[PDB]
């Protein structure tokens, strides 16, 4: 297919910045191929001089040359291996960086639709397989092709009537190798499917351990697992038998070709057309070719899978996001007035199934606006679309008589901030998490945010102060500290619009009395989302909405 | 059996 | 089996002995053409070499087949026993360990016997060259073992650094709404770039180590070959060794090199696989008479975490009973003791005049049935997932009658393909009321003498609760069975013959529903709330 050729062209364009390393590696490869081609000729000339009369000059010259060629081949092979390994690693690192940069620009709907494990497989092992195409597979393929051509040239130089027999014999070996490779691949993927089916049983058993323990059906589960194990064992036995039969066939064919070469070589020897060293070098050349052909077939088979993995990674990368045009606006001063004009929103995950319909209200800088009602957790949609996370299908949300799509990303998300019911924490320091997303923030701002959100209680004890190391995803803190750090993180930016989710239902009462009654709520629009009427004890403008419609 | 050839980088 | 392994050992010894005839006979044939022999001898060696090598290949095939057929059985039995042991208290590890150990042991034994036989024939051919090879073996092949440790250290540093970078990227991607809300995509890109920049230097070290390792591992063998060829040439000049013997040694040295290389490349993997492996009376009939006397139990974590104490609940046969109270009542321990899922740790208990563990396991599990607090359905059909654990397959009419009694007939009929409807794993796609009805049907299909159905109203609806109340309270003479319903539906607790409340692991109240609601117990406090 031309698609595979396009993929190879894209891979070459990716590997383009590593030109000098690849040139040096190819030159080292050529030197190694020449050295290992020329070694057995002198290895046979040593036997040639040893068999007949003794001449010290020829023996010394032959052993010196052979040692020199062996040393040169070893040195160049080591250099080629090092250069190719470095090139492969550089390619892997570059494509990992490019893939992460491309992935970070996609819309949230793609991340909701696509599971995390697929992205991890793309970024962990699938990106590694494409880095073995040029520095590994093309390397061994080219070296095997050139080695085979040179070896057959030398065998034709030695004796054509002995080379023609190998030429006739090789297609049988090629066909047998291809058939065995196809059968092995088929059996291997069947074995993988069977072992996945076997692991499904133990996953089901460990998932529902309480049920089976209550009903005492342990023997039934172990019988199902025994049946799955027998099904896998039959496939394993078939694979082993096929591999053993292939090895037996290969050994018999090697016997036949060796006997034919020996018989014809001795028949030509009796006419004086060959020497013992010539025959020995011919045996070494035949033994090398018989392995290099199979190496070539295996390497092509692996190159196909490498190209497939590269196709998967490139398909994952080349997705075009559905975000609107980037916004160039960013005023020095923002009033904070927000208007929704019949915004109507439907989730892109389930299109034509609207969640919001004809919503319309206005927000004031000095008036506190609260939202009430269960809504089936549908109140988070207006909070998400208020930060330009999801573009509205109908209507329009606007700030200061300007639509939200025309504002600069950093400026808009620095002027309008929000906290959810569940805070999300990273693996950095407390200072890192407080100043998250900030280009430069002094420790004084962190102190102000911590004392304004009443975090300094827990933070003061914290070893190494604020420079402590939080656990992964906040594993070293409880829910109260998570909420305190989240509200301090929101407060540290001095936002013109502040949105809170569950300010009293989930968040502490002290934080609700602090953030909603300080200077950050004196001249800034605050949108608090609560499922109860307790927020009515301080709210000014209360809005209730159910099933996508406002009362 | 036999050790399949590794033919590394 | 030891006998089959011994037979495989005999077969592999014979095959390794017979394989080596090719270089010996080609060297003898070159010597034969050197000294003007006869054609009868020539065809004799040709036929003998062909027969020996063919027999070696055939015996290799037979021995392999026997070894693989036995090791498959061994691995399957080990996996089954591991699963059976872990269920009455990893499997993928065990399977990978089993198959890797199998192939490693096969390669190790094959190449060890081949190397031993090769050493034997080479020593028979000429003492001097074999002694030289033996004395240059370890002093020249210890260096790959020295370099491989440094290489493995650098390579494992590479993989752990890559894994850490991948974990950082995955953590950044999993929290994408927060990153988009704080506009910190460039920060995550910068962190990823810093991780790769930290990787790069060590990676260069790894490349240099690869170059040095390849240099050493080729130069050692090449120098060994050069030295043995020079010594053989000097000896054949001296005349103590024939030239054909030199050809045989030239052909044998390569095979010995491959054998020792395979052994040294195999042994550490075998060692680490071994290190990974080192870590591993039936009752006739009953009326449902269940009685307790000061019964106590403890949590499985530690005996200090007491579950309950002083339990004397008398499950009246042919009547219902409701257990209420706060979380300190320990009704879960009472349910576990009724289902005999946990051993008692104090007091006395009896089921139909006999202790519950004293009876047969299958009979006790089939008689004293229970419904789980969280309903779950296994990944099977509704004719199986609603009859799991049954000794005999129920009839379709019987299963339909059970579903009708449990109210699951409509759910089964609405599903496609009738009773053979596909169900998701662990009841993921099933509704809460449907799952509760399926659990009730699974409990009622065994015709229990006592029902411990509780906590099913958390996911059930009001209609399901009304159906459960109609099945329980309005049962004909309770179907000659008892009940221990401890569900959260307080409406059905009023219809119970004798409700009770407990606190702190001990009973706190009891009596009739009106008496309990008029007393000072926890049930009255909940009613007055």
mmCIF file of N, CA, C and O in Angstrom, chain C residues 130-178:
data_model
loop_
_atom_site.group_PDB
_atom_site.id
_atom_site.type_symbol
_atom_site.label_atom_id
_atom_site.label_comp_id
_atom_site.label_asym_id
_atom_site.label_seq_id
_atom_site.Cartn_x
_atom_site.Cartn_y
_atom_site.Cartn_z
ATOM 1 N N UNK C 130 42.889 -29.011 23.402
ATOM 2 C CA UNK C 130 41.815 -28.973 24.388
ATOM 3 C C UNK C 130 42.287 -28.341 25.694
ATOM 4 O O UNK C 130 41.561 -27.548 26.304
ATOM 5 N N UNK C 131 43.508 -28.664 26.126
ATOM 6 C CA UNK C 131 44.051 -28.054 27.336
ATOM 7 C C UNK C 131 44.239 -26.552 27.160
ATOM 8 O O UNK C 131 43.962 -25.772 28.079
ATOM 9 N N UNK C 132 44.699 -26.128 25.979
ATOM 10 C CA UNK C 132 44.854 -24.700 25.705
ATOM 11 C C UNK C 132 43.499 -24.000 25.725
ATOM 12 O O UNK C 132 43.351 -22.917 26.312
ATOM 13 N N UNK C 133 42.489 -24.612 25.100
ATOM 14 C CA UNK C 133 41.145 -24.041 25.094
ATOM 15 C C UNK C 133 40.577 -23.941 26.505
ATOM 16 O O UNK C 133 39.969 -22.928 26.868
ATOM 17 N N UNK C 134 40.780 -24.977 27.320
ATOM 18 C CA UNK C 134 40.286 -24.950 28.692
ATOM 19 C C UNK C 134 40.996 -23.875 29.507
ATOM 20 O O UNK C 134 40.365 -23.183 30.314
ATOM 21 N N UNK C 135 42.306 -23.713 29.309
ATOM 22 C CA UNK C 135 43.035 -22.724 30.094
ATOM 23 C C UNK C 135 42.775 -21.301 29.617
ATOM 24 O O UNK C 135 42.982 -20.355 30.387
ATOM 25 N N UNK C 136 42.328 -21.113 28.377
ATOM 26 C CA UNK C 136 41.962 -19.784 27.902
ATOM 27 C C UNK C 136 40.467 -19.513 27.988
ATOM 28 O O UNK C 136 40.032 -18.409 27.648
ATOM 29 N N UNK C 137 39.673 -20.495 28.422
ATOM 30 C CA UNK C 137 38.230 -20.292 28.549
ATOM 31 C C UNK C 137 37.867 -19.232 29.590
ATOM 32 O O UNK C 137 37.322 -18.179 29.208
ATOM 33 N N UNK C 138 38.149 -19.415 30.911
ATOM 34 C CA UNK C 138 37.599 -18.457 31.880
ATOM 35 C C UNK C 138 38.352 -17.136 31.901
ATOM 36 O O UNK C 138 37.735 -16.076 32.042
ATOM 37 N N UNK C 139 39.676 -17.186 31.723
ATOM 38 C CA UNK C 139 40.499 -15.984 31.759
ATOM 39 C C UNK C 139 40.169 -15.024 30.624
ATOM 40 O O UNK C 139 40.525 -13.844 30.703
ATOM 41 N N UNK C 140 39.505 -15.501 29.574
ATOM 42 C CA UNK C 140 39.076 -14.646 28.480
ATOM 43 C C UNK C 140 37.582 -14.375 28.464
ATOM 44 O O UNK C 140 37.169 -13.346 27.929
ATOM 45 N N UNK C 141 36.756 -15.260 29.024
ATOM 46 C CA UNK C 141 35.316 -15.030 29.028
ATOM 47 C C UNK C 141 34.777 -14.556 30.374
ATOM 48 O O UNK C 141 33.557 -14.521 30.557
ATOM 49 N N UNK C 142 35.646 -14.196 31.321
ATOM 50 C CA UNK C 142 35.155 -13.515 32.514
ATOM 51 C C UNK C 142 34.840 -12.049 32.241
ATOM 52 O O UNK C 142 33.972 -11.475 32.907
ATOM 53 N N UNK C 143 35.537 -11.434 31.285
ATOM 54 C CA UNK C 143 35.322 -10.019 30.989
ATOM 55 C C UNK C 143 33.906 -9.682 30.515
ATOM 56 O O UNK C 143 33.402 -8.615 30.914
ATOM 57 N N UNK C 144 33.236 -10.477 29.657
ATOM 58 C CA UNK C 144 31.814 -10.185 29.390
ATOM 59 C C UNK C 144 30.956 -10.163 30.641
ATOM 60 O O UNK C 144 30.046 -9.332 30.744
ATOM 61 N N UNK C 145 31.227 -11.049 31.603
ATOM 62 C CA UNK C 145 30.489 -11.023 32.860
ATOM 63 C C UNK C 145 30.781 -9.758 33.656
ATOM 64 O O UNK C 145 29.901 -9.258 34.367
ATOM 65 N N UNK C 146 32.003 -9.233 33.557
ATOM 66 C CA UNK C 146 32.326 -7.979 34.228
ATOM 67 C C UNK C 146 31.600 -6.802 33.587
ATOM 68 O O UNK C 146 31.100 -5.917 34.290
ATOM 69 N N UNK C 147 31.531 -6.775 32.256
ATOM 70 C CA UNK C 147 30.951 -5.619 31.576
ATOM 71 C C UNK C 147 29.421 -5.656 31.620
ATOM 72 O O UNK C 147 28.767 -4.599 31.692
ATOM 73 N N UNK C 148 28.831 -6.858 31.623
ATOM 74 C CA UNK C 148 27.386 -6.978 31.586
ATOM 75 C C UNK C 148 26.689 -6.405 32.802
ATOM 76 O O UNK C 148 25.555 -5.938 32.702
ATOM 77 N N UNK C 149 27.343 -6.435 33.964
ATOM 78 C CA UNK C 149 26.744 -5.836 35.153
ATOM 79 C C UNK C 149 26.610 -4.325 35.007
ATOM 80 O O UNK C 149 25.559 -3.755 35.329
ATOM 81 N N UNK C 150 27.657 -3.663 34.510
ATOM 82 C CA UNK C 150 27.591 -2.224 34.277
ATOM 83 C C UNK C 150 26.534 -1.920 33.221
ATOM 84 O O UNK C 150 25.745 -0.974 33.372
ATOM 85 N N UNK C 151 26.493 -2.728 32.156
ATOM 86 C CA UNK C 151 25.478 -2.539 31.125
ATOM 87 C C UNK C 151 24.066 -2.688 31.673
ATOM 88 O O UNK C 151 23.180 -1.897 31.335
ATOM 89 N N UNK C 152 23.833 -3.698 32.509
ATOM 90 C CA UNK C 152 22.505 -3.898 33.069
ATOM 91 C C UNK C 152 22.133 -2.760 34.008
ATOM 92 O O UNK C 152 20.972 -2.342 34.049
ATOM 93 N N UNK C 153 23.108 -2.235 34.755
ATOM 94 C CA UNK C 153 22.844 -1.083 35.614
ATOM 95 C C UNK C 153 22.421 0.131 34.793
ATOM 96 O O UNK C 153 21.426 0.797 35.109
ATOM 97 N N UNK C 154 23.150 0.421 33.711
ATOM 98 C CA UNK C 154 22.785 1.567 32.879
ATOM 99 C C UNK C 154 21.442 1.353 32.190
ATOM 100 O O UNK C 154 20.637 2.287 32.073
ATOM 101 N N UNK C 155 21.176 0.129 31.738
ATOM 102 C CA UNK C 155 19.938 -0.145 31.019
ATOM 103 C C UNK C 155 18.735 -0.078 31.958
ATOM 104 O O UNK C 155 17.668 0.424 31.576
ATOM 105 N N UNK C 156 18.887 -0.556 33.197
ATOM 106 C CA UNK C 156 17.787 -0.440 34.145
ATOM 107 C C UNK C 156 17.589 1.014 34.557
ATOM 108 O O UNK C 156 16.452 1.442 34.780
ATOM 109 N N UNK C 157 18.666 1.807 34.629
ATOM 110 C CA UNK C 157 18.491 3.239 34.858
ATOM 111 C C UNK C 157 17.701 3.873 33.721
ATOM 112 O O UNK C 157 16.826 4.718 33.956
ATOM 113 N N UNK C 158 17.986 3.455 32.483
ATOM 114 C CA UNK C 158 17.237 3.936 31.323
ATOM 115 C C UNK C 158 15.755 3.612 31.474
ATOM 116 O O UNK C 158 14.891 4.485 31.309
ATOM 117 N N UNK C 159 15.437 2.355 31.804
ATOM 118 C CA UNK C 159 14.022 1.989 31.839
ATOM 119 C C UNK C 159 13.288 2.642 33.006
ATOM 120 O O UNK C 159 12.123 3.026 32.859
ATOM 121 N N UNK C 160 13.936 2.792 34.164
ATOM 122 C CA UNK C 160 13.245 3.457 35.268
ATOM 123 C C UNK C 160 13.055 4.945 35.001
ATOM 124 O O UNK C 160 12.012 5.509 35.356
ATOM 125 N N UNK C 161 14.032 5.601 34.366
ATOM 126 C CA UNK C 161 13.843 7.005 34.009
ATOM 127 C C UNK C 161 12.720 7.171 32.990
ATOM 128 O O UNK C 161 11.891 8.088 33.106
ATOM 129 N N UNK C 162 12.661 6.278 31.995
ATOM 130 C CA UNK C 162 11.583 6.332 31.013
ATOM 131 C C UNK C 162 10.227 6.077 31.661
ATOM 132 O O UNK C 162 9.238 6.743 31.330
ATOM 133 N N UNK C 163 10.160 5.115 32.585
ATOM 134 C CA UNK C 163 8.907 4.824 33.273
ATOM 135 C C UNK C 163 8.460 5.998 34.132
ATOM 136 O O UNK C 163 7.264 6.301 34.198
ATOM 137 N N UNK C 164 9.403 6.667 34.799
ATOM 138 C CA UNK C 164 9.055 7.838 35.598
ATOM 139 C C UNK C 164 8.521 8.965 34.722
ATOM 140 O O UNK C 164 7.532 9.624 35.076
ATOM 141 N N UNK C 165 9.158 9.195 33.569
ATOM 142 C CA UNK C 165 8.662 10.214 32.648
ATOM 143 C C UNK C 165 7.269 9.867 32.136
ATOM 144 O O UNK C 165 6.394 10.740 32.043
ATOM 145 N N UNK C 166 7.040 8.592 31.809
ATOM 146 C CA UNK C 166 5.729 8.171 31.328
ATOM 147 C C UNK C 166 4.665 8.327 32.407
ATOM 148 O O UNK C 166 3.530 8.718 32.114
ATOM 149 N N UNK C 167 5.011 8.021 33.660
ATOM 150 C CA UNK C 167 4.066 8.209 34.756
ATOM 151 C C UNK C 167 3.739 9.683 34.960
ATOM 152 O O UNK C 167 2.585 10.031 35.235
ATOM 153 N N UNK C 168 4.739 10.559 34.829
ATOM 154 C CA UNK C 168 4.485 11.994 34.939
ATOM 155 C C UNK C 168 3.545 12.456 33.832
ATOM 156 O O UNK C 168 2.586 13.202 34.078
ATOM 157 N N UNK C 169 3.786 11.997 32.601
ATOM 158 C CA UNK C 169 2.925 12.380 31.484
ATOM 159 C C UNK C 169 1.505 11.856 31.667
ATOM 160 O O UNK C 169 0.535 12.560 31.366
ATOM 161 N N UNK C 170 1.364 10.625 32.160
ATOM 162 C CA UNK C 170 0.039 10.041 32.349
ATOM 163 C C UNK C 170 -0.712 10.760 33.464
ATOM 164 O O UNK C 170 -1.918 11.010 33.355
ATOM 165 N N UNK C 171 -0.012 11.116 34.544
ATOM 166 C CA UNK C 171 -0.638 11.889 35.612
ATOM 167 C C UNK C 171 -1.084 13.256 35.108
ATOM 168 O O UNK C 171 -2.163 13.739 35.473
ATOM 169 N N UNK C 172 -0.272 13.889 34.258
ATOM 170 C CA UNK C 172 -0.663 15.172 33.681
ATOM 171 C C UNK C 172 -1.880 15.030 32.774
ATOM 172 O O UNK C 172 -2.774 15.883 32.787
ATOM 173 N N UNK C 173 -1.931 13.961 31.977
ATOM 174 C CA UNK C 173 -3.028 13.786 31.031
ATOM 175 C C UNK C 173 -4.326 13.368 31.710
ATOM 176 O O UNK C 173 -5.410 13.698 31.217
ATOM 177 N N UNK C 174 -4.242 12.638 32.824
ATOM 178 C CA UNK C 174 -5.449 12.166 33.495
ATOM 179 C C UNK C 174 -6.228 13.307 34.136
ATOM 180 O O UNK C 174 -7.449 13.210 34.295
ATOM 181 N N UNK C 175 -5.548 14.389 34.505
ATOM 182 C CA UNK C 175 -6.170 15.551 35.136
ATOM 183 C C UNK C 175 -6.348 16.693 34.150
ATOM 184 O O UNK C 175 -6.149 17.861 34.496
ATOM 185 N N UNK C 176 -6.708 16.362 32.911
ATOM 186 C CA UNK C 176 -6.779 17.363 31.848
ATOM 187 C C UNK C 176 -7.744 18.522 32.105
ATOM 188 O O UNK C 176 -7.404 19.651 31.711
ATOM 189 N N UNK C 177 -8.946 18.337 32.682
ATOM 190 C CA UNK C 177 -9.774 19.520 32.985
ATOM 191 C C UNK C 177 -9.098 20.534 33.891
ATOM 192 O O UNK C 177 -9.235 21.739 33.662
ATOM 193 N N UNK C 178 -8.347 20.083 34.898
ATOM 194 C CA UNK C 178 -7.650 21.021 35.774
ATOM 195 C C UNK C 178 -6.551 21.768 35.027
ATOM 196 O O UNK C 178 -6.387 22.983 35.203
#
